[PDB]
Amino acid sequence: TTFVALYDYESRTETDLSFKKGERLQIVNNTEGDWWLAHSLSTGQTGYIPSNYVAPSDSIQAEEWYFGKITRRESERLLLNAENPRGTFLVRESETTKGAYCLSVSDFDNAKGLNVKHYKIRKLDSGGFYITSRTQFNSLQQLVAYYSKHADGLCHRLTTVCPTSKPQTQGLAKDAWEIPRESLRLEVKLGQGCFGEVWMGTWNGTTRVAIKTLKPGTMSPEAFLQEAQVMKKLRHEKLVQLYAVVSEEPIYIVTEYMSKGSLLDFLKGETGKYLRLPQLVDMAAQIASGMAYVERMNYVHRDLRAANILVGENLVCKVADFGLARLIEDNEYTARQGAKFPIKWTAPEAALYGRFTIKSDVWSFGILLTELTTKGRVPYPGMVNREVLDQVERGYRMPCPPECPESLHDLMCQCWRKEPEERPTFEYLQAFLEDYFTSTEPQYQPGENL
Ligand SMILES: Nc1ncnc2c1ncn2[C@@H]1O[C@H](COP(=O)(O)OP(=O)(O)NP(=O)(O)O)[C@@H](O)[C@H]1O
């Protein structure tokens, strides 16, 4: 009946419990959802813990190398990390065959360099588990134990478990949402937007967070609180999580801190000097993935651009600042006008008639695509804000960027169709970009290569 910690966790409050990976814990109350009351069997300490940091003892989820429901693409990003020795692996659920699993392994070819090999694990009618029919096992852990000693047909002996980063807890702590202004300490100014500032800081003197401040008069706290309730329910690995808020003016917005900064700045400079097409297309794919979730949830971003995409380790990109723009009470901004309104990323029907939809976000994604292929160069280079809308209304569209493949420029043009409903979906954009360089995420090795 005991559980086991999958990761190390540091206590953030007076009532939660710290633990180290591998510690055995007794859930002495699970009547909650994301935060459970636990008791450490080794230390005797009690306290709340994030439910996504533990797994039932002896379960397959308890296995260090079992990544469960991770896609083939996501598993590849993790395995291809430069630090990973050859033979680094993970096991996950197969996407094409229900009930089946998959062993993904990192390999190096002197005529292909670093690469990932995928092997589908089928479970017979009897009960055996196998990659090759000439070798079956009664369990996934038995299989893994075998190939850790002998490659036996695999690209390399299983050597190291794929490392990963601690998952985000849902909320800063149990029941924390509308928090006291004094629970935060601002430490490093990260930037100054148009309606406030952003700082790297600390919550409760223990947790690293990002804090955005809104100048009084920007938007009504009441409307803000209603909208924050909606955004709070949006959870996806390619969306920056909203942690907590201080609803009274000056309004505070606490989200997860992205150390690598914005995509725009990462695009310009030295960080993006040797950035090649395959990298830029993968970042675009991640962005389309988060926006497809937004699409599935029937939500609307309203301010999509490279400045609003954040970067993390493993070239991870996350969609930020969604929903807020709609609350701005600024008179000029409300009329899609002013030096504060991002007209260069706005679809004509949104600017002209205020018709903001997932389709106008698709138009914005097309513009973002140009920043990604021009090292962050500003859209419509020779045009001033005040003349952009009239030009685009008459049919003007940016030409193919220098060095950008025409095929990608064609995608942008689809996103910029005059008819919003003729514009592609984010589901489509994600699939197109993920499979851009011949790779619809298929192909599994056969079995015995020698
Ligand atoms: N969660 C975060 N983690 C790290 N840095 C962040 C984070 N959020 C914002 N920033 C940084 O802060 C600046 C953004 O401030 P912000 O007020 O959001 O301006 P913006 O980029 O101009 N767009 P907008 O907010 O739509 O007007 C950029 O330097 C970002 O890198």
Side-chain angles (χ1 to χ4, degrees), residues 190 193 198 210 212 255-258 262 303 305 307-308 310 321:
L190 298 187
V198 180
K212 172 176 275 205
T255 65
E256 89 188 72
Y257 173 64
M258 310 287 298
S262 84
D303 197 24
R305 61 189 143 103
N308 278 334
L310 298 174
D321 290 316

Side-chain angles (χ1 to χ4, degrees), residues 6 13 21 129 170 198 236 269 284 329 339 341 364 372 380 383:
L6 304 171
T13 77
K21 172 171 182 184
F129 272 110
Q170 280 328 284
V198 180
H236 189 268
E329 293 179 332
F341 194 78
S364 300
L372 272 166
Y380 310 93
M383 304 188 48

Side-chain angles (χ1 to χ4, degrees), residues 368-419:
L368 204 169
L369 279 182
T370 69
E371 304 178 88
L372 272 166
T373 50
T374 61
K375 288 170 294 281
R377 215 155 297 133
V378 186
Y380 310 93
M383 304 188 48
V384 68
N385 274 21
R386 52 134 174 115
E387 51 176 307
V388 177
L389 217 213
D390 185 70
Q391 288 263 35
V392 301
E393 122 214 304
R394 283 190 316 88
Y396 180 84
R397 298 295 186 270
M398 273 183 286
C400 186
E403 282 325 297
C404 172
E406 186 60 45
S407 344
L408 266 192
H409 174 246
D410 183 63
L411 192 67
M412 298 172 188
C413 287
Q414 287 183 65
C415 290
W416 304 331
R417 291 180 157 127
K418 170 172 100 145
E419 286 296 329

Side-chain angles (χ1 to χ4, degrees), residues 81-132:
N81 190 88
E83 322 187 326
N84 292 344
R86 262 102 234 205
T88 293
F89 74 101
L90 67 74
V91 170
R92 43 163 191 104
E93 299 177 352
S94 151
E95 295 157 82
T96 53
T97 295
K98 254 40 103 202
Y101 296 94
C102 167
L103 170 73
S104 310
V105 201
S106 89
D107 184 69
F108 182 93
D109 216 312
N110 67 168
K112 169 147 104 232
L114 206 64
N115 68 103
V116 171
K117 318 257 209 268
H118 295 267
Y119 306 89
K120 192 177 244 179
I121 292 161
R122 300 229 168 211
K123 190 198 173 178
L124 291 161
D125 352 290
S126 342
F129 272 110
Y130 71 101
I131 273 172
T132 173

Side-chain angles (χ1 to χ4, degrees), residues 413-431:
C413 287
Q414 287 183 65
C415 290
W416 304 331
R417 291 180 157 127
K418 170 172 100 145
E419 286 296 329
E421 290 302 294
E422 268 183 62
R423 263 112 78 162
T425 61
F426 277 110
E427 188 189 53
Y428 175 83
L429 288 161
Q430 185 188 345

